[PDB]
């Protein structure tokens, strides 16, 4: 429905049959999850941020449920410090940033 | 004003008498700006990101105007790829996520 930012905007996600916690990150173009087991094939890719860059596995057409809302999109998997839900999926759950 | 995420949530900021563009980032605890001239004293610090860590200068009580809304708080300055407005300031301008 709505969430304030006094604390990190953590949500529960279900992906690849597993339950995980992830950060809603309006500053992320893409969604990136810590290392996990995800079926299917993938393609190499590299993403950047503060501190440098990391190498990740790119999975397309991946189903994910975010705090109850389903979305299908690309998901990156690699050495990120935390699971991040990026705008590619945020737009699917009608996530808007209002102020 | 409401803001969707189909595109990067860029906003205009005024800080230290200068105009800059910055990304509204709910995944960021802190506000971090690219190298710029700011008055007052600072104290070293290191923040983390997806690619690792960067060294930055920490300034407190810094006044910033984000899309017309004033806020005062800590601002970090260092080698970040882009200007990021983090939650420490996002809460001051009443930003929220809606889904």
């Amino acid at each position: 429905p709505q969430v304030t930012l006094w604390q990190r905007p953590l949500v529960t996600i279900k992906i690849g049959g597993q339950l995980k916690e992830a950060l809603l990150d309006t500053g992320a173009d893409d969604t990136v999850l810590e290392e996990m087991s995800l079926p299917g094939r993938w393609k190499p890719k590299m993403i950047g941020g503060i501190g440098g860059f990391i190498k990740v596995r790119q999975y397309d057409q991946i189903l994910i449920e975010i705090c109850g809302h389903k979305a299908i999109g690309t998901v990156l998997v690699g050495p990120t410090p935390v699971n991040i839900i990026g705008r590619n999926l945020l737009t699917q759950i009608g996530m808007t940033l209002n102020f | 004003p409401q803001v969707t995420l189909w595109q990067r949530p860029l906003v205009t900021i005024k800080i230290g008498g200068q105009l800059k563009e910055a990304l509204l980032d709910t995944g960021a605890d802190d506000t971090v700006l690219e190298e710029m001239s700011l008055p007052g004293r600072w104290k070293p610090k290191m923040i983390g990101g997806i690619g690792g860590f960067i060294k930055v200068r920490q300034y407190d009580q810094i006044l910033i105007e984000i899309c017309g809304h004033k806020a005062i708080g800590t601002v970090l300055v260092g080698p970040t790829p882009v200007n990021i407005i983090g939650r420490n300031l996002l809460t001051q301008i009443g930003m929220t996520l809606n889904f």
Partner: peptide, 4 residues
């Protein structure tokens, strides 16, 4: 892309 970039996870800023």
């Amino acid at each position: 892309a970039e996870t800023f």
